[PDB]
């Protein structure tokens, strides 16, 4: 195991500009059609969300570039990707990404999500491996390419999987998934959404009410994270790995004040940020 890989390429991380994205319900209150303001962490509008390239193809001949570096967790991360083929599986938030400190690990494994908090011993380039098992006659998904050993684990949550796809429309959908993670005072909160889309590449213009998925009573100290890819074995086709092509958008939260507008149904709509410009 621990088959290192990366090459070197990377060029300048393509930047972009999300217009108005990442407005999560900043509480568990049901509300009517009012106007609500809130000081919290948010992604400021018209920010410079970095556009990272995973497995990256180039017009010329095969060539796959690998570049999902570890990134700073700062105070919160807006994670989003399109990915019609489920090649993103989860994330490995932590402090040192070794033993002597704990680490959180979220894997998807599309029949059941499962989260552990062990003193893992991750490789320097973790990923899930997919192979064939020759008994059970079924392509299993052994995770031992991620970590060496997992001892002292102090948690284990199982649940219907997050990344539930649909498509079933031969295109025109592309199903943009978003996630926002924030970690305060010994908790860990995840917010999600699945949205149909029709734009070419980048972020659309509407509003997304990211409603919360879970909250995890952990207390772990987090300052650096990474993301998991599900590469499969190649076989009799002339290392033997590297499925598909993937990319995701990352951008960090900051403490700001917003003026959310509620529906009569109980859902948001347009969020106004005090801080953007003088008009706001």
């Amino acid at each position, epitope marked *: 195991q621990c088959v290192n890989l990366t090459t070197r390429t990377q060029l300048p991380p393509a930047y972009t500009n999300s217009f108005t994205r990442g407005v999560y319900y900043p509480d568990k209150v049901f509300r009517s059609s009012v106007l609500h303001s809130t000081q919290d962490l948010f992604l400021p509008f018209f920010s410079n969300v970095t556009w990272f390239h995973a497995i990256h193809v180039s017009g010329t001949n095969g060539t796959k570039r690998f570049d999902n570096p570890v990134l700073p967790f700062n105070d919160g991360v807006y994670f989003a990707s399109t990915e019609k083929s489920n090649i993103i599986r989860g994330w490995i938030f932590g402090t040192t990404l070794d033993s002597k400190t704990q680490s959180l690990l979220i894997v998807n494994n599309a029949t059941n999500v499962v989260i552990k908090v062990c003193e893992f011993q991750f490789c320097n380039d973790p990923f899930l491996g997919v192979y*064939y098992h*020759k*008994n059970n006659k079924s392509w299993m998904e052994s995770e031992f390419r991620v970590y060496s050993s997992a001892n002292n684990c102090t948690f284990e949550y199982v649940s219907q999987p997050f990344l539930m796809d649909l498509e079933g429309k031969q295109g025109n959908f592309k199903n943009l998934r978003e996630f926002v993670f924030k970690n305060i005072d010994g908790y860990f909160k995840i917010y999600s959404k699945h949205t149909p889309i029709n734009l070419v590449r980048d972020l659309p213009q509407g509003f997304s009410a990211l409603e919360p998925l879970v909250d995890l009573p952990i207390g772990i100290n987090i300052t650096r994270f990474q993301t998991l890819l599900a590469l499969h074995r*190649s*076989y*009799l086709t*002339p*290392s033997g790995w590297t499925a598909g092509a993937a990319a995701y958008y990352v951008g960090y939260l900051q403490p700001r004040t917003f003026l959310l507008k509620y529906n009569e149904n109980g859902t948001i709509t347009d969020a106004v940020d005090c801080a953007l410009d003088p008009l706001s």
Partner: antibody, heavy 128, light 113 residues
Framework: EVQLVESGAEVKKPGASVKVSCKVSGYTLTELSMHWVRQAPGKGLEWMGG????????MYAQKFQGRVTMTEDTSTDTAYMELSSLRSEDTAVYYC?????????????????????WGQGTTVTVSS | EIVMTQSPLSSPVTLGQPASISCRSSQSLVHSDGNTYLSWLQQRPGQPPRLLIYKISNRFSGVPDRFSGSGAGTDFTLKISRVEAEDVGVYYCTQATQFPYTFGQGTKVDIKR
């Protein structure tokens, strides 16, 4: 991309049993199908053992049936083959041949048969 | 069970010229789902047999592309073109259908001295 490791020589005495081992490396033992092939010296190649990607069972050469067994330690990535009641005409090099059980991606399934990588042989010898 | 054969049981070829090994059968080797299973093992003296053109007409990884498979059904043929050194050994033609496999009657080649 695969490497097979043999198990050294073994001189024996007629009537005993002998077990030959083969360590894979590069892939894992739970996605290859092992076949054992003798080389009676100065002669051709002879098949025994093997594995059917179908039915998962492990066929046994009629010539050596009720006389050989084959087991798999999937933890240390070695396969074992136990020939018993060795007659005088079993001095041979014993090859550990393998392939990959299927072919392709998680989308396309071809149960693939044959031998692809051949692992360097051990040399048993019966002698009274 | 199958039980094919060979053709030249030798054929000390010349330098720089092509060569032809001819396999044969005693069944129809078209396995169900229609893909027949041949392979053309090359064994040096004192070494394990490596592999060459498996599955009728293909090529294995690292085979230096002088080798060519042909045939169908019951006749088969390997053909090297413009041979040189480092191609001297025995060329078995294993089948891979009907469980109890079986190998070719063997066929050695060498230099045409």
């Amino acid at each position: 991309e695969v490497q097979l490791v043999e198990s050294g020589a073994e001189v024996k005495k007629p009537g005993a049993s002998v077990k030959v081992s083969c360590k894979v490396s590069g892939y894992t033992l739970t996605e290859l199908s092992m076949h054992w092939v003798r080389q009676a010296p100065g002669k051709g190649l002879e098949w025994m053992g093997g594995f059917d990607p179908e039915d998962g069972e492990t066929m046994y050469a009629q010539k050596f049936q009720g006389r050989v067994t084959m087991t798999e330690d999937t933890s240390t990535d070695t396969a074992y083959m136990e020939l018993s009641s060795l007659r005088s005409e079993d001095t041979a090099v014993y090859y550990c041949a393998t392939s990959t059980a299927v072919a392709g991606t998680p989308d396309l399934f071809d149960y693939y048969y044959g031998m692809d990588v051949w692992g360097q042989g051990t040399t048993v010898t019966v002698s009274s | 069970e199958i039980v094919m054969t060979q053709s030249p049981l030798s054929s000390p070829v010349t330098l720089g010229q092509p060569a032809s090994i001819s396999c044969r059968s005693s069944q129809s080797l078209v396995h169900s789902d229609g893909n027949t299973y041949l392979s053309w093992l090359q064994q040096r003296p004192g070494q394990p047999p490596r592999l060459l053109i498996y599955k009728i007409s293909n090529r294995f990884s690292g085979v230096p592309d002088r080798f060519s498979g042909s045939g169908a059904g019951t006749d088969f043929t390997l053909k090297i073109s413009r041979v040189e050194a480092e191609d001297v050994g025995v060329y078995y033609c294993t089948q891979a259908t009907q469980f109890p496999y079986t190998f070719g009657q063997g066929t050695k080649v060498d230099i045409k001295r």
